[model samples]
Target chain A: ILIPLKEKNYKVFLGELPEIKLKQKALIISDSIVAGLHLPYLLERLKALEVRVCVIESGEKYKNFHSLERILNNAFEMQLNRHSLMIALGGGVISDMVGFASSIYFRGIDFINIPTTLLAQVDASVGGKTGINTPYGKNLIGSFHQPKAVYMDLAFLKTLEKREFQAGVAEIIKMAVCFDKNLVERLETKDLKDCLEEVIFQSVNIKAQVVRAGLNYGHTFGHAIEKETDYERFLHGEAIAIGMRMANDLALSLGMLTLKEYERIENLLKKFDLIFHYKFILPKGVGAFEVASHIPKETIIKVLEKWH
Target chain B: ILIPLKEKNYKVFLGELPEIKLKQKALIISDSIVAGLHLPYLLERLKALEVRVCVIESGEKYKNFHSLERILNNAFEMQLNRHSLMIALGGGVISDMVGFASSIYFRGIDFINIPTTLLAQVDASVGGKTGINTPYGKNLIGSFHQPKAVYMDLAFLKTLEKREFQAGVAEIIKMAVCFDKNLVERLETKDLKDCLEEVIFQSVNIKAQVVRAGLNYGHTFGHAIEKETDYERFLHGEAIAIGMRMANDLALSLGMLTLKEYERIENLLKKFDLIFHYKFILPKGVGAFEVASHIPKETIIKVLEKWH
Candidate 1:
């Protein structure tokens, strides 16, 4: 999949990790979890030039300036120039900060994303939306820095758990409802695991047109729940799952959605059994959502009260 | 003066503050000295918005994440959204961080630069180079975030000290040497204070074409002295002043410069009394400098010992 951005378009390769052939100064930043799992697989593949590794403790907690600064400090200490490459070898947290850190180091440097998590492989890793979350909000501080390349090897997904798989499907579902209803028709009819490639392809296609895509359909409310639990209680996809349900309710309450439509969306959620849940700037459509061309706190309060 | 960046082409005003009328959710990030001096002037004119202010302590010390977080925190507390405006009203330090903070806030927001110092007026506040210095290097953490507008009020220079005045002349001299030697004839003939507007105009003109401009002609060594002194002994311009001197010496020794040309440049620096001074890339011309199409650090020991 080739992500087409205005500047520096990059290709995303799924399946096996292709032969790595970079001969420049490179640094690999990965979480301890992913590093422990597949760091050896990565390190041995590239023989042209040896790679340096910076293994950060995995989790959302390490996604702030502290880790970013550590990565930067290593870059400088290694005397990595603007021509150098920094690769993120983990999921969203590692990818976000590494991309962001790369974006700012010497006013941007080259980096690659090798997402280990299902959520990242399908969604987070492809987009250039790199950011570190602050107490204020998620992705509040970030830059649109595209990676030079992305490797979404499905080989890693063999180890990914069921909850992780469903979480990723929620994002696939979000993009599906907002941009491609056929995604709904297919998911309802086909096996979830069997359709992974098509799901990623469709979702990525929607994200390619992110300038107009409803990527943020449930994100406003998603963050509310994500923040309420300190980003711990749920994976981003899980939170997004609950957030979509709430928006469906709000859409229904406001008559933007019908009872039959709401039930169909709810049944999709029950299929995964991923459990819970804002002016949210709710993106108002299906197979191409409508924009206000665009609010409310109290209406959301009513929705939250009724949420189970 | 309009900067023709690819995405956001913004203008640079060269007079008073003008009637401020931003009614959006706005936050003003200024330095202590600047806010104390002209905060009221801005407040009175901005009656439509009655803007909120975040005054940071002035100088290079505050140009880091510590102060940036404060601005971001206040921005979040004030509930400034992506549509909000962040106004930077001070020298390069304030402008750099504010521009960077604004760049990353909600993945870039609208911010305006009202450069208070002459150095900032002529160079720093333009060119969209937003950054913060790390222990490793200057502007190691940064972005290419263009401001929505730039106001270069000459009134701010009324309070500028002699060192500040001559410091600004250093950058002016750099542009004059590399891009516009006609500025040389003018600067030698005209009064320094009298020519500030023209100096700023030409310097900004050079920076506008910064993609090709030899703006870093002296910066490589400028930071060396700047670091040796802890960025305290000399202002940025003063450091660049000496750095330009050093480059001239290197250019002369390498026969890239003539004896007559070297003295001409040196005489100009002596006029300003900037006390001291790369390649570690010497932009090798006059009326448009050259590029690597470019190292040796050892010959620099010969030049450093021969200094006055």
Candidate 2:
């Protein structure tokens, strides 16, 4: 099934992982975290299948030039050829790393993503946003490479920590605020546990619309902030949460959103207990003047004017 | 007109470039080569439209994590906000760098790729594959970021040298080898001058299909070559040319292609005068086995079998 999310469409396969009747070898590109959790599961399923596996350390930090090197090295070590498959298992970081590696590895390779984290399952893995992070920022070096398939097994979500789950919610919130108010309303009404499948469905759907409406608003500023912070302390979802707040502020400041609407948004974030105020890591000693100095004000103003 | 090339789809806007229709600021990402040739054209166009342009130098070597940092720094300096439009001018390097930069800069921003090189216009710029080169290899760090719109002006091709133009043909050959025998046949029947338009059109179309076929071949080995070589010698297309030859040779050795077909393929390359054999560049003191030793045979074989 092709599911559209954020800025791209995803070929999402549900149900049991199918038999990969391959005539050649395949490589599994995952991080330590995923290697720890899903590798065995994948191995069991694909034992009869002809393929090899190489695991990398998982994290956003690994999604950079170095990690890409490691993945390429693994591909080389495994002698991955054109007929080979790169199976990516993990969160956004793994998806990005594997996907980026696939794109330029020999020019490009086909890879499938078995996203384990909520963020990966719903967002990152879907859009074909592949790449590694740099010391200067997150996903600083990367590409918009589409995956052959994005195998999202909800069963994988069992391993997500509470914080990671919460962070995923933050991205869902950001999507709703910008693209679909109705989706935002839906989010406001649902409890996390009562709506696992429903939440994934809604979040993925809303994100798809946001991507369709055009990949705009939240991420642009959020990424800059994440970059400025070196991405050491911020989870992608957390940075997105801050981005959503900042965008709201920008909108409110320009009268695009009313004060009440902004407050309601803030309260909504508080309900999730997601931090919306971003002074915690705003480049030490940089005030609004300094912060605003870094932003391209006229552009924001133009996008804001078009929003209503 | 919508054209698909390799992994990217190109929406050629015939007539005039689209207007930004805003008083917004813009972030322009480009390499020195393109910045020199077309920055003035872009600036001239944007100025008439009353938009400000922030240009940066993003050469291939600079197409790394640090390059993105420098661009983000400029975006920050320009105060690019959520609504700002980021314009990437140049080839694949600029496209990847700017696309990845925009994805992370402020979460996401409006960006367009004004591809200047035939390679970028036909391949990287058309696809949303954006990122920087890593120490490990080319495009190792990146994301699948589609542009808001891809603005291609064929006039940009006017600046390409003969060798650069031939490099692009090498990629076109890969596309034909994998998917379009007709295209290869068409290429064989025509010379460059008489078939410029058809070649360009077919080149873009074939590449777009390969991207869709997801039968990624040649690239896995090519990336290893890039990493091993430190990216000093080969251009992306140059590497791809070598990769195509390597894959063909491998295919012949493995009996995937007949000896006759192999010679036919070589003859076709010769028609373009593409130098597929590089005696001087092979890793020193390395036998074929030793050279192959540097590549992960398992992964390479697997990927190769998939493509076959």
Candidate 3:
């Protein structure tokens, strides 16, 4: 698959991690979990280049200064230059930390993505946003340092926990509701048992149309819910599902989404068990409820009551 | 003067600092010397909006992570958002540290420059280069963050020490040789006594044409000499002058420059008292020596021997 961005265009090779023949120096960054699972495999794919490794502790919590410093320290020790490459070989957190480090090194350097998680494959695969969280919030401090190329090998997803795989589905549902009514309708009829690869492509395709504000449909509210309940209660995708429910309630009250349309989305969410309990709707524009609109603070509270 | 960048163009106002009218929050950064010299006046010019100040120690040595962290820490405390402005109120070092921090804050934010040093006014005033020296060498980590606007007030030049002012001329000579024969001829006929303002514009204007390789003509050698002598022996421009002298010897030997043309440039350097003691060569363009060429390492050593 091809990922097109204004600054540069690159390819996203799925299925298998291709033989990487990089002559320049490179540093491969991965979270400990993925490193343990795929390190030997990832190492075998590289045919050339002097390489170093930085295995950081996994999880969103590890996505902070300490991990960033570790990545930078390793690169510095390796004497990586502007010409050097940094390869992110894990999930979203690893991709974020690795890409963010690459952006700041020598001002910025080229980096490649070898995302191992389903969440990372569908999400980070397209968007160039790279940053770590701060004390206050997920910094999402964007360097927009798109990967020089990306290789999303689905085989790595086999090691992901079942609950983790479901979290990745939440994002897929989130994408379908905003940009792919066909995907929503198709997902409603299927269990996504064999449709996983197609789902990944559809999600990437949905996001690839070169878009933004609409994607924030559930994001604004989803992000807030994570803060109120703290991150432990729900994964990002799960919380995103909750936010989607909230958005639908608001949209229904504002008379933007028809009751029948809202019902179809609810059924779709239930099909994947994403949850309407906290998944208050912000699916802004895909199926029937994809359009975005302003809601009054009074009405916003009224919508919150539905999830409660 | 207008800075024509492909991404976004901004203005660079000379003569005096204007009364800034910003609705968003702001953080003003300056070095210790510039802070005391102009902070009061700088603060007074702000007619609206809440503002904070960060005064760091001055000089090239202080241009490292410590200053950057202080700038980031202050911005975080103020809770400056993406809309908030980071104003650089000192020389190149402060501009670098300020711009680099601003580039990373909230991923990146808009910034304005108030470069006090003549070198900064002529060099950084045009280039969007923002970085610091690293343990190995100058990182020059390129954020390519063009400032939103810049204010270059010549009145501040009065407080500048004499030897320092001469250092600024090194960059001007460097600019002229690569891009402006008229600037070279003008300098040869007159001392930059009252002509400093026009000289700044010409240097900026010449550099404004958007060029690089020729600029690095002396830089590659100049940077090497700085490392050999350990930076204390000469300022950047002085070292550049030495490099220019060396480049010319090689250029003349390679038949890239005429002996008569070499004589004219030597006279121009002496006119400003830059130096033949070290200023070896690499004017690559504005006059007779503006072209760059590969030199044998053996020939390179032979050229260095002439100055010794």
Scored by DockQ, the top model is 1
lDDT of 2 by residue, B1-308 (tens): 43332333345542235454545777777766777787777776663222444455645667676777777777777667677778877787777877877876655677888877777766776657666665654555455667877777767878888778777777777666665667777888977677666666766665455445222445655766677775787776777666656666665554456677767777877788776545311111111111232445664565455332
What's the true lDDT of residue A68 in model 2?
A: 69
Give interface RMSD, per candidate.
0.9, 6.0, 2.6
DockQ of every predicted complex: 0.76, 0.07, 0.55
The 0-to-1 C-alpha lDDT of every candidate, in the order given, reads 0.77, 0.64, 0.77
Tens digits of per-residue lDDT for model 3, B1-308 = 33333234777787767788998999999988888888887888885467988889888888887777788889888888888899998888888888878887887899989889999998886777787766656754447678888888887888998778888888788778767889888888876877877888787776777535666657767888898898888888888777777777777777767788777777777777788464233554345344445557788888776742
RMSD of each: 3.9, 11.9, 3.0
| Cα-based TM-score, every candidate | 0.88, 0.51, 0.91
Which ranges in model 1 have alpha carbons more than 4 Å from their true place? A1-8, A47-50, A219-234, A249-263, A275-308, B1-8, B48-50, B211-213, B220-233, B273-305
What is model 2's DockQ versus the real complex? Answer: 0.07
Q: Is the docking of candidate 3 incorrect, acceptable, medium or high quality?
A: medium
Proportion of true contacts reproduced by candidate 1: 0.95
Candidate 1 chain A: worst-modelled 10 consecutive residues by lDDT = A277-286
Among all candidates shown, the one with the greatest TM-score = 3
DockQ of 3: 0.55
> Which candidate do you rate higher for lDDT, 1 or 2?
1
Candidate 1, residues B115-233: lDDT per residue as tens digits? 88877877788778889877776677888888888887777788778877787778788888888878888877887767777767777777776634377777777878777876657
True contacts kept of 2: 0.02
